[PDB]
């Protein structure tokens, strides 16, 4: 159903090439750049993402997010709408169809999990997180694409952005870093990775940054998190950390 930009319901067992063909043939153009990202709306976080979206608009870059009205993604969608009101930005939210509070079959209309309407495009996964694999596969395939016009040598650049914590953030970072081409940028967990850049230091940083998340997590979960962080740090030459025109500088340095 077309929410009222575009909203589609694609099952988990979907071909990334088919999605790319659908998005490029008659929806959007080749992407010079592509980036994937209650919350603390601090001025630093309020300005860094504004600069990021301005850079994406300047370069015509795709932005990929979860696509929910609750969280920082709502702020991103609002900023996108404001800039469009002020050569169009492209934002894709990805979520699970079952995870949606309400489901409508269709051009159906959606009226207020709750999904934001600011994002231009939205995808729903029919599994019963279940969209991480699809997003990672799509990012890898796009990195596999060749665009001679792009200044980046050969393949289209891709950048991963980290701002918050949680097991989902670490899982996504580990999945992306498992792919050599993608590179990560760090804005709780962000402070952990910034401090780290063997087990004692990681444990101390994780405890200091997230007093409650570590407490709730079992010992096995903590060990798995430490393993993921060690794997991510082993490839530190890709990962970059921002020091607490800096967003563009950091992205360019990482690329």
């Amino acid at each position: 159903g077309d929410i009222q930009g575009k909203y589609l319901r694609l099952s988990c067992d979907t071909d990334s090439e088919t999605l790319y063909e659908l998005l490029t043939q008659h929806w959007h153009l080749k992407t010079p750049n592509l980036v994937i990202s209650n919350f603390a709306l601090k001025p630093r976080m309020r300005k860094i993402f504004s600069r990021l979206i301005y850079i994406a608009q300047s370069k015509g870059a795709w932005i990929l997010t979860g696509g929910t009205h609750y969280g920082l993604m709502k702020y991103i969608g609002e900023v996108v709408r404001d800039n469009t009101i002020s050569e169009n930005i492209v934002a894709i939210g990805i979520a699970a169809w079952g995870m949606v509070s309400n489901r409508d079959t269709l051009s159906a209309q959606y009226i207020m999990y709750i999904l934001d309407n600011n994002h231009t495009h939205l995808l729903l996964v029919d599994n019963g997180t279940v969209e991480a694999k699809l997003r990672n596969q799509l990012e890898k395939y796009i990195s596999e694409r060749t665009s001679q016009d792009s200044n980046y040598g050969g393949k289209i650049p891709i950048v991963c952005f980290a701002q918050g914590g949680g097991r989902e953030t670490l899982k996504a970072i580990n999945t992306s870093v498992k792919s050599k081409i993608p590179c990560v940028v760090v804005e709780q967990i962000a402070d952990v990775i910034a401090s780290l850049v063997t087990s004692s230091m990681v444990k101390e940083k994780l405890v200091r940054f997230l007093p409650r998340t570590v407490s709730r997590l079992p010992e096995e979960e903590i060990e798995s998190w430490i393993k993921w962080l060690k794997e991510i740090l082993e490839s530190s030459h890709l990962l970059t950390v921002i020091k607490m025109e800096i967003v563009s500088n950091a992205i360019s340095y990482a690329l």
Binding site: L10, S11, T14, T18, L19, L22, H26
Partner: peptide, 10 residues
């Protein structure tokens, strides 16, 4: 057109 393409995709 668009509906047929979407149906063929999934």
């Amino acid at each position: 057109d668009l509906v047929n393409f979407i149906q063929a995709n999934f």
